Amino acid sequence: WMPAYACQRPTPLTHHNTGLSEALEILAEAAGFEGSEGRLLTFCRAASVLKALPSPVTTLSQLQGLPHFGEHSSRVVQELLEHGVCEEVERVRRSERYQTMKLFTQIFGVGVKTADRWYREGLRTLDDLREQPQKLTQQQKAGLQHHQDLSTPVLRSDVDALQQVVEEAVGQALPGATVTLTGGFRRGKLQGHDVDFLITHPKEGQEAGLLPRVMCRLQDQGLILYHQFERSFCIFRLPQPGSWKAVRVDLVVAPVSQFPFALLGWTGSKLFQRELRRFSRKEKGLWLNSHGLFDPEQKTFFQAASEEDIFRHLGLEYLPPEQRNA
């Protein structure tokens, strides 16, 4: 009854198993910090199955036959149903390793490998890192300076204000170019950190060279606190009552021929896209990315004019963005 791939079932943003899914996601996150990518995927997939169920799990019986539930994930759920806590999860939460890796990887410019090296060197706090700007890259310096602002999510109303400023710059850079809101806000989030815009033009080829022109114009407006092409990872100045705050904004350009693929990828969720690409390759023999869908035996790319086309090509029922919260 429950399909095995997340892209085969609707997953709404809010659901009926929030506590269970959150606990499994702690174990997934911890597995990533230890470089255990297989275990991370399993725990993420198990959590996602619970998000897709139509009602709360109340008895261990209800996990039978659900994909991605084996001995370990079932034990986690059993303990939460019986006692309201899972000792393994609680041990992770209160561990110095988990807490410090989470803190450091939250910094823009710091991934698991850098965080782990710093951990092994004995560093534990943001002020530890600030006392040794020796080691830091320019990107990490910006991430550290803006960390407090970047830790607090922005509202959809903030996103709409940001979109108007981006549209103004994009219109000067290339009249007729369009701006689409992607990421979690397109999936229905009311607040988030993942402010993402996808830019195209209806005349194939006109978008070439566009992103530098957009970035130059946003910088001249004083809006860019940090930037380093077709993807730009920025920190922007967002107005607030009497002041402003830093916000992470990603700008992406695609030709219109690729726009449906880029829209699909950049709308997420992350797990949804990994599962969609896995399904494509393993079940349909087609290779999917954010630029296109390739048939390696005919050696041809699918044309798509819509996300609906892409789901049809893959033999999947269409899911609107709001149902891609795997």
Add this chain to the structure above:
DNA sequence: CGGCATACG
């Protein structure tokens, strides 16, 4: 056992 998504900066 092998596999686990697939890109760009």
Add this chain to the structure above:
DNA sequence: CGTAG
């Protein structure tokens, strides 16, 4: 190495 979804 980092970043994205």
Add this chain to the structure above:
DNA sequence: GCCG
């Protein structure tokens, strides 16, 4: 960690 789980699936095929």
